[PDB]
Enzyme design. Structure first.
Site, PDB file in Angstrom:
ATOM      1  N   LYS A   1      11.408  29.763  29.093  1.00 31.88           N
ATOM      2  CA  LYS A   1      11.010  28.457  28.566  1.00 31.88           C
ATOM      3  C   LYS A   1      10.253  28.641  27.248  1.00 31.88           C
ATOM      4  CE  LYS A   1       7.366  25.428  28.361  1.00 31.88           C
ATOM      5  NZ  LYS A   1       7.205  26.239  27.108  1.00 31.88           N
TER       6      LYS A   1
ATOM      7  N   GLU B   1      -0.458  37.511  28.156  1.00 35.02           N
ATOM      8  CA  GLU B   1      -0.819  37.764  26.771  1.00 35.02           C
ATOM      9  C   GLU B   1      -1.596  36.556  26.259  1.00 35.02           C
ATOM     10  OE1 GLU B   1       1.999  40.896  25.646  1.00 35.02           O
ATOM     11  OE2 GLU B   1       2.742  39.148  24.501  1.00 35.02           O
TER      12      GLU B   1
ATOM     13  N   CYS C   1      -1.687  35.654  17.411  1.00 31.82           N
ATOM     14  CA  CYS C   1      -2.563  36.122  18.493  1.00 31.82           C
ATOM     15  C   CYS C   1      -3.561  37.119  17.943  1.00 31.82           C
ATOM     16  CB  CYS C   1      -1.777  36.840  19.593  1.00 31.82           C
ATOM     17  SG  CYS C   1      -0.129  36.250  19.956  1.00 31.82           S
TER      18      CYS C   1
ATOM     19  N   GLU D   1     -11.368  30.653  19.172  1.00 31.97           N
ATOM     20  CA  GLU D   1     -10.369  30.935  18.163  1.00 31.97           C
ATOM     21  C   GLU D   1     -10.100  29.701  17.315  1.00 31.97           C
ATOM     22  OE1 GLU D   1      -7.641  32.826  20.832  1.00 31.97           O
ATOM     23  OE2 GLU D   1      -7.013  34.283  19.305  1.00 31.97           O
TER      24      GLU D   1
END
Lengths: 482, 482, 482, 482
Positions: A180, A255, A289, A386
């Site tokens: 997905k 992750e 990331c 972040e």
């Protein structure tokens, strides 16, 4: 319409080897983040269609595992070649749907291409053991075999690479997979699916599902046929996916979020740290990331580093990915922009100084002015969250002992960067740092051969390298009476 | 009190390297499963005691990880020697609380020890990589380092070995560990903590917390300081522990339930088969995780194997563990007995036949007659539940296609056993079987050099071998600019 | 001649990346082994020309090793593609100059290519170590680097494959190589080199030297720049080359002679053993290093096996390689015809009975009749020497103990073949066999993923697998103060 | 005499498990190198006595290889446990026969014992692989087994550690071993052989042969039973042994001579570089094989280095090994003393200057003043040959590119030492140095876990680490049809 092959842009999902619309004919729209214009519709599928994708994968497994690794690699390398051959289009499709400048998207395609090649080759090297027996009347043999039906939920910030990284190893290990992709950026994933089809991937072995993330996600995590799940996204969502996989004890790769410190020491080469700061903070507009989230600079070079960086930043051009000279594209969506502003606002209210940028770009939409902040303290939100945007917050540190406490003082532990010229300081700090990956006098650490992943709240498992394939196979102990 | 060293029998828990009772002075009672008597009391601790245990571990970590692998080996090896030296007493304590005969108790101490030794050695071998770079300006160095504070919850069936199997790898890696063992069998866990303490394990590196399984469990799973958790027990609890560990995305090792097929083929050596059957089934009164649950016998040898097994089982001697000549001790509790009775009554109702035993033993308590059943079909309960008792249910098969189907017809996949003389058949069936461990012409497979664990709903990860330690370390990628 | 790319046939050597005649215009002739016709001329070089090649390899090494493994892989992959693209021409050159049928030469070209591919991939996976330190103030890093200029001396029986198996792992490891192909079949090596030029192998990295075997050999072994040499041929010459190589302490791969037993047991599948016999005995007319030299058939199935072997031998077609359907070419030269004769004459003289063939074939030249012998015993020459021809000497045996003794009663230990069904006898015999490679219920065992090499007087090192590149790299230990 | 266990001093050889004098009853005398006083006699054996030890090794093999790795480990760990417990006497024997300070001799005992331990553990970890097949019909299984009868020829500088460096890995692999130690220091071999006997090492598994170097060596190299040979000593002898071993293609481990450069760069911590100079040049009185032979100090730091060097040499007390404070024992014999003087005189003759020492010590025999030389050039003898004495010749260098050329301008390449503080330089230089081992900011590199050995004329193979055992085993590939 602007491609050498317009059949690469797909408006159907790929379920069990067939191109299909949603069961209800529901579709949602996908917009160019730079211009806001419609790029067409894709299916809005859910639980039922995902269930068929999972079943197909189960049915495709026995035939796929029965092939040799060499054979699977012939298909995978044909897929690799097709990706190389359609590089210009794949990049244009990506630029259009995700935002990044064509040069970066061509980087991403070559990057992606290399994961397919790497796992084609790794498939041929998944190896067990023969071991010395503790009992003389017995022999120990250990083999490895595919885990079963895999699933993967990939993010939007690298819509192509993310597909190759998760599809590559599973197929290479002898597993079928249900993917997905991100709702923001489905075309790159479908473009990959289409070329995988051409390469000769058997029907069912690969499925790309597009629709509602809670409906599709929920099916994936509740379905006992799916034996392993890979997820790259937010830490918050990853915690929930682990919970929903708990009833069936799935093997998980996670992750998750990072909080990359980028450390410029007393004795660093300043210019090079600036070269490595531009790369680690501003490529993909800071949305990766691995992107720097916190700059830590030593008192004794703080003033000099800040000027050099401000300069460097001002030579970066903002504009639509298809324009030449353009190096910073838009932020992905409206919510991404509002997040940057929030961090800037929090810093300003807490005493920080705007060195440059600080606001939305006149071009509108997702475009934001590359920003540098000075006098950033750890009470500010940017120290703990972040940004996912082009913002360079500069914290001050006095001592190596204070730095390590600062750098580690975070939930997460993905990437980290370090500039120093002293061999013993480099090791001491690299070893002390609670991070899965550490850049030493470099701002770019990502490649196909090195193990990628984080520690602590940044999740579980490692992608790429010889470590990549391990999570996709399972081990068997054979105890043979002699 | 019948020990050379009576101080090995502990009535206080071991926290932060300190022997302590519960904060509220509370206790629960441990009973002798064979004679019903009281073996004494242990603390009934909970959250707060576990919390201090967890903080102590973190406080102890910097110092423990800073020792060399060799220095850690020294201490672990002293603990090995101390465990060997005190074999007899440890064997007495174990038999007394758990039920197993002295020979099997002494067998376990020996087995437990070899784990301590193995990981002592493995610690000196945890290794990273240096890989060929894809960029000429960069260098790839991979290193491994302790994950952090660890926790383990162990069961009662191997109350000594499980401690060595989970404390051993953690410590070798450079990790401190908090251990919550089974409430039915806590003394074995404590006695080694006591022997570890004397070996030079610094304070905080090991804790053994005792009391409320839910309260202690919840504290472990929700505490952010715990970065990895190991659990061996029932699949139902494993699932919930994985759910509870989710908010912190802990590294999980799960050694959950099984449903072992013991497979007797056309061309099996029946006398060897019967020898393996007795061993894989009646070890520890059938209460090991890897015990045969389902016997599958080919129709040509079915009647002959049945008669030979039945005859052998009937000559096995049931008695208290300290009684010389006894090979079968008691089931652990009343619940266990009733489960065996339920499985028998169920099978009998559905048309199966009793060949030996079937009833509770005259000696009462947990003593049950070693039992063999013919005419067992896949509709009967024992086909789907683990018995955890001395019950041999004989199923029946005709072909090789059929047997693979039946054996894999379960959510579990831990251990399996296969007896056949044809090399081609052996490999064929060994590959088709979905199990982490397969005995080939043997019924005893468990050792320290071979990787132990299951697939599917039997769990995640491996213990023993070079594989056992990998789940206690965390990998770090170093990208070095050249 | 009559090929799509006539320029594939080469009449000059490849010294230092440039095509050259001998320093003194000298040549020698190369003849078709099936029809005796002059295939053309090739240079006759020695020490002078070999010294330039060696000196060229050292000048090329710095620039070759400086490339990434990724880059070298690409150049080798381009060579792989061309070897595949030109498969049909390369076959005919090989058949024309060596003799084996087309189907077989095509099979060899693929074999050869699969090796180029394999080491292209292995080049990227040559790995060092990071190790747990035994002194806390130090850190251990192991890395691996190319050895230096390598040299290879290859035989005539696989003149394409041997160039791939030696050039492949060298170039892959970062190594230049100087090759001296068997002067009986030099075109196949020159063709390969020509395509390597097309792939883009930088001048000096590859050299194919042709001429005086002893002069090129003695210059290779005396030159201190050649840091490693790889030899594949007779044990006789292997022993000499090791000695000549002592004054510079070269790294040595030696692939020497064997004395392969083909073992057919009591309870074997006779029909598969015959299929195995054909492929292991008569392929490339018995002229492979792994070719069965002695058949050992159990007393109980001797006649039954001999009859079936005779029948299948008679089903083979002797004739020229270019002709369609031909399954047996000539022996590469006249001396080879005389060896086969010498062995047959000796068997008869000592009591063996001829069962088919036994004399030279009507087609003349190197053509010999497919031959089967019965009543063969250990006093015979074939018991101790390699025939290197289509001779099937059948020995008798009465027990397991006796077979092991018969199979091992040799100085050599390359390949061995075993046909049995009993799992227990397979492992006992496979383990007892003093051989580098054992085929179990198969007669074909050569491939790229497996370690190819022998023990005892069959040599040292292993080609192919992940072990294959390891002899082409040297290991460096870095001790780093913290 | 004055040793807790006077039976550790042996005056007889150890052949096939019994202590014998020679056949001819011949002997030769062993002197103290610090006094000249006779220390006893040892047998002067030849071919006949060696041949027997070898046959006894062949006989003992089957029963030794048959034991599990764990069973062999228990025997090796008792030998470990006996070397540690008797280390006091063993150190004293060592000092007496060889010279080095009592404290240094102790370090060697603990070093030797570390090897015994390491390999006991390693023997349990020798591993083959199971590999992904390129052919569905077949399975690839690789196992490792002992090579066979091993021989070791060890030098005098480490009469204890070298025994353990070669015997440990051999016995651990499953081999027996025939050891011929240095004729000048045989008592350490014999004492450890004696301990091995007491340890339970079966007869014939280990033999120690003493006598004529030429006679014993030649038998070892000519005998076909000996299938591998480990040697440590001069490059010249190494070249001969490889020649002698060539007729039987023996597997060689060669640790040959060095020519170590200790490199002091511009940016070194000068005090630390001196601490490493002293440690790498005057350990064992300059008689180690990894000893610094060429000091290369940069122009900017040249003067300052020299002053500090002499300034630490004056603290070094020359004296007999048993005297407290003695840090420099005598060289081994007169020939060694004549060599040191030969270099000093040649260096003086060509321009060098005497900083300290330069003469024979008053104490006489083979004692010698620690010497430092400034103004040493490439044209001098000590530039190409190994002193093997206490001689620090300081070479001057300017650029980095220059240094690499000077450091590698030699046929040898065992150890190298490198002092620099810039991370980039350390990596550039350490990668460019053609040496098996490079010490980074440290003078002591040797330990048991790291691969020890050289490149180029410095030999073949590695000792210690997981790489140590590989030369003692053989690879068997099993191609199983399924």
């Amino acid at each position: 319409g602007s491609m050498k092959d317009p059949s690469l842009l797909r408006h159907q999902a790929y379920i069990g080897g067939e191109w299909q619309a949603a069961d209800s004919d529901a579709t949602f729209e996908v917009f160019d983040p730079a211009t806001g214009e419609s790029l067409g519709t894709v299916p809005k599928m859910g639980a039922a269609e995902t269930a068929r994708a999972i079943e197909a994968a189960q049915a495709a497994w026995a035939g796929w595992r029965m092939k040799t690794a060499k054979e699977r690699a012939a298909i995978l390398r044909r897929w690799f070649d097709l990706v190389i051959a359609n590089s210009d289009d794949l990049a244009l499709i990506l630029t259009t749907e995700q935002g990044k400048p064509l040069a970066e998207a061509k980087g991403e395609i070559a990057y992606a291409a290399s994961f397919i090649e790497w796992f084609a080759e790794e498939g041929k090297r998944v190896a067990g053991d023969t071991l010395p027996t503790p009992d003389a009347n017995k022999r120990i043999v250990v083999v490895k075999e595919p885990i079963g039906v895999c699933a993967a939920i990939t993010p939007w910030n690298f819509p192509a690479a993310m597909i190759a990284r998760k599809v590559g190893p599973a197929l290479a290990a002898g597993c079928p997979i249900v993917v997905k992709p991100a709702e923001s950026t489905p075309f790159s994933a479908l473009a990959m699916a289409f070329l995988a089809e051409r390469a000769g991937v058997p029907k069912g072995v690969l499925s790309v599902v597009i629709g509602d993330p809670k409906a599709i996600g929920t099916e994936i995590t509740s379905n006992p046929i799916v034996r392993k799940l890979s997820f790259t996204g937010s830490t918050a969502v990853g915690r929930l996916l682990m919970a929903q996989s708990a009833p069936t004890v799935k093997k998980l790769t996670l992750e998750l979020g990072g909080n990359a410190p980028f450390i410029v020491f007393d004795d660093a080469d300043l210019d090079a740290a600036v070269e490595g700061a531009i790369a680690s903070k501003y490529r993909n507009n800071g949305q990766t990331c691995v992107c720097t989230n916190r700059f830590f600079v030593h008192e004794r070079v703080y003033d000099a580093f800040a000027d050099k960086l401000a300069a460097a930043v001002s030579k970066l051009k903002v504009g639509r990915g298809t324009e030449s000279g353009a190096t910073l594209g838009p932020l992905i969506n409206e919510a991404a922009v509002k997040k940057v502003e929030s961090h800037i606002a929090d810093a300003l209210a807490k005493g920080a100084s705007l060195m440059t940028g600080g606001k939305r770009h006149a071009l509108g939409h997702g475009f934001f002015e590359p920003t540098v902040l000075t006098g950033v303290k750890p009470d500010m939100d940017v120290a703990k969250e972040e940004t996912f945007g082009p913002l360079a917050p500069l914290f001050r540190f006095a001592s190596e002992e204070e730095l390590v406490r600062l750098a580690n003082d975070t939930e997460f532990g993905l990437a980290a960067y370090l500039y120093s010229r002293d061999i013993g300081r480099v090791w001491r700090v690299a070893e002390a740092l609670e991070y899965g990956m550490v850049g030493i006098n470099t701002g770019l650490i990502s490649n196909e051969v090195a193990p990628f992943g984080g520690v602590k709240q940044s999740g579980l498992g490692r992608e790429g390298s010889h470590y990549g394939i391990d999570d996709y196979v399972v081990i068997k102990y054979l105890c043979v009476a002699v």
